[PDB]
Design a binder for these strands. Structure first.
Ligand SMILES: [Mg+2]
Ligand SMILES: [Mg+2]
Ligand SMILES: [Mg+2]
Ligand SMILES: [Mg+2]
Ligand SMILES: [Mg+2]
Ligand SMILES: [Mg+2]
Ligand SMILES: [Mg+2]
Ligand SMILES: [Mg+2]
Ligand SMILES: [Mg+2]
Ligand SMILES: [Mg+2]
Ligand SMILES: [Mg+2]
Ligand SMILES: [Mg+2]
Ligand SMILES: [Mg+2]
Ligand SMILES: [Mg+2]
Ligand SMILES: [Mg+2]
Ligand SMILES: [Mg+2]
Ligand SMILES: [Mg+2]
Ligand SMILES: [Mg+2]
Ligand SMILES: [Mg+2]
Ligand SMILES: [Mg+2]
Ligand SMILES: [Mg+2]
Ligand SMILES: [Mg+2]
Ligand SMILES: [Mg+2]
Ligand SMILES: [Mg+2]
Ligand SMILES: [Mg+2]
Ligand SMILES: [Mg+2]
Ligand SMILES: [Mg+2]
Ligand SMILES: [Mg+2]
Ligand SMILES: [Mg+2]
Ligand SMILES: [Mg+2]
Ligand SMILES: [Mg+2]
Ligand SMILES: [Mg+2]
Ligand SMILES: [Mg+2]
Ligand SMILES: [Mg+2]
Ligand SMILES: [Mg+2]
Ligand SMILES: [Mg+2]
Ligand SMILES: [Mg+2]
Ligand SMILES: [Mg+2]
Ligand SMILES: [Mg+2]
Ligand SMILES: [Mg+2]
Ligand SMILES: [Mg+2]
Ligand SMILES: [Mg+2]
Ligand SMILES: [Mg+2]
Ligand SMILES: [Mg+2]
Ligand SMILES: [Mg+2]
Ligand SMILES: [Mg+2]
Ligand SMILES: [Mg+2]
Ligand SMILES: [Mg+2]
Ligand SMILES: [Mg+2]
Ligand SMILES: [Mg+2]
Ligand SMILES: [Mg+2]
Ligand SMILES: [Mg+2]
Ligand SMILES: [Mg+2]
Ligand SMILES: [Mg+2]
Ligand SMILES: [Mg+2]
Ligand SMILES: [Mg+2]
Ligand SMILES: [Mg+2]
Ligand SMILES: [Mg+2]
Ligand SMILES: [Mg+2]
Ligand SMILES: [Mg+2]
Ligand SMILES: [Mg+2]
Ligand SMILES: [Mg+2]
Ligand SMILES: [Mg+2]
Ligand SMILES: [Mg+2]
Ligand SMILES: [Mg+2]
Ligand SMILES: [Mg+2]
Ligand SMILES: [Mg+2]
Ligand SMILES: [Mg+2]
Ligand SMILES: [Mg+2]
Ligand SMILES: [Mg+2]
Ligand SMILES: [Mg+2]
Ligand SMILES: [Mg+2]
Ligand SMILES: [Mg+2]
Ligand SMILES: [Mg+2]
Ligand SMILES: [Mg+2]
Ligand SMILES: [Mg+2]
Ligand SMILES: [Mg+2]
Ligand SMILES: [Mg+2]
Ligand SMILES: [Mg+2]
Ligand SMILES: [Mg+2]
Lengths: 123, 119, 209, 114, 56
RNA sequence: AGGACCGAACCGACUAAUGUUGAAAAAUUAGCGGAUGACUUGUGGCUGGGGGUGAAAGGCCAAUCAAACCGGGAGAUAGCU
RNA sequence: ACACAGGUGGUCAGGUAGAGAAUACCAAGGCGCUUGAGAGAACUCGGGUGAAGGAACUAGGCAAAAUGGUGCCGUAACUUC
RNA sequence: AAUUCCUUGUCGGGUAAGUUCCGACCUGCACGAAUGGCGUAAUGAUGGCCAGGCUGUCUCCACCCGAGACUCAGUGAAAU
RNA sequence: CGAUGUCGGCUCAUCACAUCCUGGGGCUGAAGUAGGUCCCAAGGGUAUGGCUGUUCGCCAUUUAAAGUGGUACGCGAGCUGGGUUUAGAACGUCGUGAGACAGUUCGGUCCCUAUCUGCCGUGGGCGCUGGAGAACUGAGGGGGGCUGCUCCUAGUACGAGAGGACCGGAGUGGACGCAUCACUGGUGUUCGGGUUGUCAUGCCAAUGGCACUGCCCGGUAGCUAAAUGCGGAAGAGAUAAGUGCUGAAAGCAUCUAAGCACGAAACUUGCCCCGAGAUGAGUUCUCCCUGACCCUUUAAGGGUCCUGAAGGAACGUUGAAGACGACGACGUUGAUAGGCCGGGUGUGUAAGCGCAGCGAUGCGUUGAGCUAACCGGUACUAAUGAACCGUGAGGCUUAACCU
């Protein structure tokens, strides 16, 4: 359940540690963004020498929420934090090369095959 | 809304209701019949009749429980020495509500609540 | 096609083999027994009038018991009436089981909703509350404005205001029927139907398909 | 009700082992990726148990790849396959929600020897 | 929040049309003492459904 | 030592809510400032209306002040309603 | 103006904890505030808790929430030291 | 600028975006030297801006506890 | 002018169409995609933020689209009071001055218990022509109507390529709405436990009172949303713009004059809800009452005695029904409520005793004890025998049938 002004941790080696969601894409008056959802973000904190720079505006895909995701048995998978992987604005492919922490089965598609390829654990 | 709930608020807070039903249960055990309002009598059945079912098994623990509920050793003694074996065969329903009209000060519907094995 | 009169037993879930939990609403459907067949020559329309359940003999009235005695059937707890399609007929003392829904796939369930009592416009009509701070004087959940200035000295009909909420007939459409257990008179529909537990339900086959 | 209980007892699983909160459990669930059912393992500490018969559930917390992961299994679901008590623990609560801010040495629980 | 014309005694009577009291329909009679009481209430002497439930 | 510090009594009155035919013709509740000093308080006294007093707001002078109140000139005058 | 949640100077100063005349619970002593009884709608008042997010509210972080003690370590620009 | 109309002046910083803020420029409509000029540590229930923490402020409200509101009995107003 | 509160925001809205999106078309200097322009069309929908008192505007990022206006520039007896526009103070400027400036700057009391109309709900009365209990029809009224993206068709048509479809089908979403509590959660001052201070129960132990429920930790039912089910339609009819067919007037031509066909999210239906006070008061089914007499002003007349039906109402136990009424269940031939038994759930191994330890404490008895609203049972208590209301065959006139 990610909205605007929500801070997120960064799950890749793109160079950011802490980003802020500025827009939940895909629909008018759209309140929230779960996992697998694309969010336009800005960067609030970065490493000194990264691919990205503090104040850049780009997209990101949410991969972990503290609210969690439900499975068709009724089960739910919660995380302790909110994490996103940065994307390009246009090509919408991931920028980093090494994914940190687990991801979920809702992520897998033709679109995020790279992320499920690089994740150390897929729940 | 009040769906499937229980317990009357009686325009009192929770500690006042608990101390009022503790006093009224002790007065009913003491005199075996009292005259109070019909709502207080109906909510008192849910206090007194568990004390008698507790009093059917005279243990030290149950004496301590009845003391934590009543805070009167005279009431706990009358419960386990008299009303226990008096009601040892009744499957609940140890008391009786008798509506007795209307209070002169506020037109409140009054009732006599008494124990069954009194007379 | 006609429907049947059941009763909301409660909700549960059906675990499939595939790991899917289907939230179902158990609807017991006893033998609906017909009490009257209405037709065009006497009544102007084609329908049946059914009854279900049982009733206390000291409480069923002489008009009602004579109405069941003419059909020659046990008194049930009510009387409902279902319009007939063409080429469809039933006898008077006929019993109708839940095997009628044996090969349907979606139903529409009509029930009487829960009584919310006198409800405000936040709950009833989903109005926004006003500001809980920033100066608000006694106006946190009020409906705000209700009209305009002098042009129609009057509030319009159907203005959304507070009042009785619930306790009324609603129909949920296109519910997937999961299981039809004729032996213990059940009907498991996917999802949540209106009504409280133990209330009467009208299950008809889905008209929108 | 009796009808509900009859519908639920025919769906329950007869082999659910006895586990308490604070027990380190290992749950083997079914994973359908592509078309091949495999059996993924999940192992952590039971922080909560909710007993509702068929609707019974339990919560497992583990620290995976630095991140803390809670997962609420439905007990009588067929998508779980095995439940194994690896290490039983000694706590004096029913629900260990305080472990969500304890890490490392602070989040230890002693062994419930019997 | 206040009127602009004086309401009539006709409107006053029509508003008081529903303020009438309902008299008690019938007093139940005790079977032993033969005195009248409210149905489901004890008598004044302390009888109810025959027995003397309380002295006085 | 201190027109020093924190903070009750005490003095004051910054903010919000209530109340606004009030509990109250200015208050209550929760917070707030000073609190050994140019402090505060009791009792008694003095200054009188174009006058007093005023760390000065035209503030206060008995719920009344860009000139108090009471009585009188006085039935002022009113091309106004 | 009231049997009015206001105002009113001095004196006495028990116990446990506590720096304390704060605060909590009590003693001596004195009260339960001169309409009650029910019910447990909207709405208002005064409070309690809240998923995920955390000022995006708003004129404005108003109000709430939060901080809060003792001891020790340690403590910047600037400075009238 | 507590002074600048034109003006949201221009440039820079800060922000994803800043008519406000800070630093500069000077083209000072219409600053300016005891109706004081420019600085200034400390102080301020002072004005403007920013950040951390915090949170029902809000997204979007939900439930609960009490006093009213509602019903009964008694007394019994008011503006108009 | 013996008072019509004047910006902006909030909350509710509602209408117009000169239509922003979606829908249907015509022309194109329309290859396709994407556009330009005009016509028809108002069913639904129609951003969040930064700055600023702002409306506006600029900017950031969205979206199918971020419509234009009316409504006392809608809405202060609905909120706010930042701006404007009171009294205090200051700057610049003007004036000798008091003072002044659509110049700026800091601060600065927003009342009303709703009589009527109106509206949202909910009842009482009477009526509908004997009374009563039910089930209906449906005159009419209201609700609802949004849309993206992907895939297939098909890299097909088109095109030199680049690119890239119509039509048609399937899936998955966003916003909104209805319902529900099985799941995930919230609350759960009526459940369990821990703990601080103090007081008390003679004391120990164990408990209880107060301290915001003392502070906390969990949590039943219930209510809930953030949770999960469903919906928007398809179809038909008549059409708008428009497209035509045949065909003259006007030997041709011509969509029109006669005649016929197609045609849109608009219209009427189809879907949902109310609904016979629809006084035009409807329909069906069932039940109940089949006594004597007096009267004068003899008539839809008045009265006496006997009779008291079907049913209802009242009372009581009450409810996932409810402001009160109302509605629903039940009243001994009884599970309506409480209690009780058993179970479940929650909390988390009670007290007492024994052992170990100097002791705090730990261990055994012990997953113990307690356990609200839950589930299945059970007449133990309370739901009284009655009494009350309601009557006694139900107008006239024709018509037709049967005697
Ligand atoms: Mg109950
Ligand atoms: Mg009261
Ligand atoms: Mg208390
Ligand atoms: Mg209800
Ligand atoms: Mg709002
Ligand atoms: Mg006010
Ligand atoms: Mg308020
Ligand atoms: Mg008019
Ligand atoms: Mg007038
Ligand atoms: Mg009245
Ligand atoms: Mg000092
Ligand atoms: Mg104060
Ligand atoms: Mg001080
Ligand atoms: Mg002045
Ligand atoms: Mg004065
Ligand atoms: Mg004078
Ligand atoms: Mg003068
Ligand atoms: Mg003279
Ligand atoms: Mg005169
Ligand atoms: Mg008094
Ligand atoms: Mg006083
Ligand atoms: Mg003391
Ligand atoms: Mg309340
Ligand atoms: Mg709080
Ligand atoms: Mg709680
Ligand atoms: Mg929260
Ligand atoms: Mg909690
Ligand atoms: Mg949280
Ligand atoms: Mg803002
Ligand atoms: Mg805003
Ligand atoms: Mg504040
Ligand atoms: Mg606070
Ligand atoms: Mg100047
Ligand atoms: Mg300017
Ligand atoms: Mg700039
Ligand atoms: Mg700002
Ligand atoms: Mg500057
Ligand atoms: Mg100067
Ligand atoms: Mg000079
Ligand atoms: Mg100076
Ligand atoms: Mg009264
Ligand atoms: Mg008067
Ligand atoms: Mg005027
Ligand atoms: Mg006037
Ligand atoms: Mg066109
Ligand atoms: Mg047009
Ligand atoms: Mg429109
Ligand atoms: Mg239509
Ligand atoms: Mg804007
Ligand atoms: Mg900001
Ligand atoms: Mg309008
Ligand atoms: Mg205009
Ligand atoms: Mg206006
Ligand atoms: Mg108005
Ligand atoms: Mg206004
Ligand atoms: Mg008005
Ligand atoms: Mg102002
Ligand atoms: Mg001034
Ligand atoms: Mg002016
Ligand atoms: Mg009527
Ligand atoms: Mg209609
Ligand atoms: Mg739930
Ligand atoms: Mg929970
Ligand atoms: Mg719950
Ligand atoms: Mg204590
Ligand atoms: Mg002790
Ligand atoms: Mg005490
Ligand atoms: Mg059509
Ligand atoms: Mg045409
Ligand atoms: Mg032609
Ligand atoms: Mg021709
Ligand atoms: Mg056609
Ligand atoms: Mg559509
Ligand atoms: Mg029983
Ligand atoms: Mg204990
Ligand atoms: Mg033990
Ligand atoms: Mg053990
Ligand atoms: Mg247990
Ligand atoms: Mg039990
Ligand atoms: Mg039960």
């Amino acid at each position: 359940m990610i909205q605007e002004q929500t801070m997120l941790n960064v799950a890749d080696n793109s160079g950011a540690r802490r980003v802020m969601c500025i827009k939940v894409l895909g629909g008018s008056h759209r309140r929230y963004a779960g996992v697998g959802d694309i969010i336009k973000i800005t960067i609030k904190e970065a490493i000194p020498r990264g691919k990205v720079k503090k104040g850049d505006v780009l997209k990101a895909v949410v991969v972990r929420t503290k609210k969690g995701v439900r499975r068709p048995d009724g089960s739910v998978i919660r995380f302790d934090g909110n994490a996103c992987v940065l994307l390009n604005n246009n090509s919408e492919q991931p920028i980093g090369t090494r994914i940190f922490g687990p991801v979920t089965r809702e992520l897998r598609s033709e679109k995020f095959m790279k992320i499920i390829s690089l994740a150390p654990e897929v729940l | 809304m009040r769906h499937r709930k229980s317990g009357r608020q009686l325009n009192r807070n929770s500690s006042h209701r608990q101390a009022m039903f503790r006093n009224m249960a002790g007065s009913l055990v003491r005199h075996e019949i009292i005259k109070t309002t019909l709502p207080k009598a109906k909510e008192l059945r849910r206090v007194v009749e568990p004390l008698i079912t507790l009093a059917k098994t005279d243990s030290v623990a149950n004496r301590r429980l009845a003391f934590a509920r009543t805070r009167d050793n005279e009431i706990v003694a009358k419960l386990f020495n008299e009303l226990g074996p008096r009601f040892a065969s009744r499957a609940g329903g140890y008391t009786r509500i008798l509506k007795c009209g209307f209070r002169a000060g506020d037109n409140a519907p009054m009732a006599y609540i008494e124990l069954v094995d009194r007379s | 096609m006609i429907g049947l009169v059941g009763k909301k037993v409660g909700m549960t879930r059906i675990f499939t083999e595939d790991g899917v939990s289907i939230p179902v609403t158990v609807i017991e459907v006893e033998a609906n027994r017909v009490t009257q067949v209405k037709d065009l020559a006497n009544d102007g329309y084609r329908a049946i009038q059914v009854t279900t359940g049982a009733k206390k003999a000291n409480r069923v009235t002489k008009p009602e018991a004579g109405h069941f005695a003419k059909a020659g059937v046990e008194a049930g707890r009510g009387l409902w009436e279902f319009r007939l399609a063409e080429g469809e007929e039933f006898t008077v003392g006929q019993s109708i089981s839940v095997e009628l829904f044996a090969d349907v796939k979606k139903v529409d369930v009509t029930g009487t909703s829960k009584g919310k009592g006198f409800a405000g416009t936040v709950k009833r009509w989903n109005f926004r509350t006003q500001d809980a701070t920033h100066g608000n004087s006694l106006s946190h959940r009020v409906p705000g404005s209700i009209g305009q200035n002098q042009t129609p000295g009057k509030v319009f009909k159907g203005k959304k205001m507070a009042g009785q909420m619930g306790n009324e007939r609603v129909t949920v459409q296109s519910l997937d029927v999961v299981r039809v257990d004729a032996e213990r008179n059940l009907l498991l529909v996917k999802g949540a139907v209106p009504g409280a537990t133990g209330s009467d339900l009208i299950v008809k086959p889905a008209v929108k398909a | 009700s009796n009808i509900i209980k009859q519908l639920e007892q025919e769906q329950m699983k007869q082999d659910v082992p006895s586990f308490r909160p604070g027990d380190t459990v290992e749950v083997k669930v079914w994973v359908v990726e592509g078309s091949k059912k495999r059996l993924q393992a999940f192992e952590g500490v039971v922080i909560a148990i909710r007993n509702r018969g068929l609707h019974s559930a339990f919560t497992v917390r583990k620290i995976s790849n630095g991140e803390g992961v809670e997962r609420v299994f439905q007990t009588h679901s067929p998508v779980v396959d095995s439940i194994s008590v690896k290490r039983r623990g000694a706590v004096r609560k029913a629900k260990l929600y305080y472990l969500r801010e304890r890490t490392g040495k602070a989040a230890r629980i002693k062994e419930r020897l019997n | 929040a206040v009127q602009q014309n004086k309401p009539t005694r006709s409107k006053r009577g029509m508003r008081r049309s529903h303020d009438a009291l309902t008299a008690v329909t019938s007093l139940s009679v005790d079977k032993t003492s033969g005195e009248k009481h409210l149905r489901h209430h004890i008598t004044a002497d302390g009888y109810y459904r025959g027995r003397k439930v309380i002295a006085k």
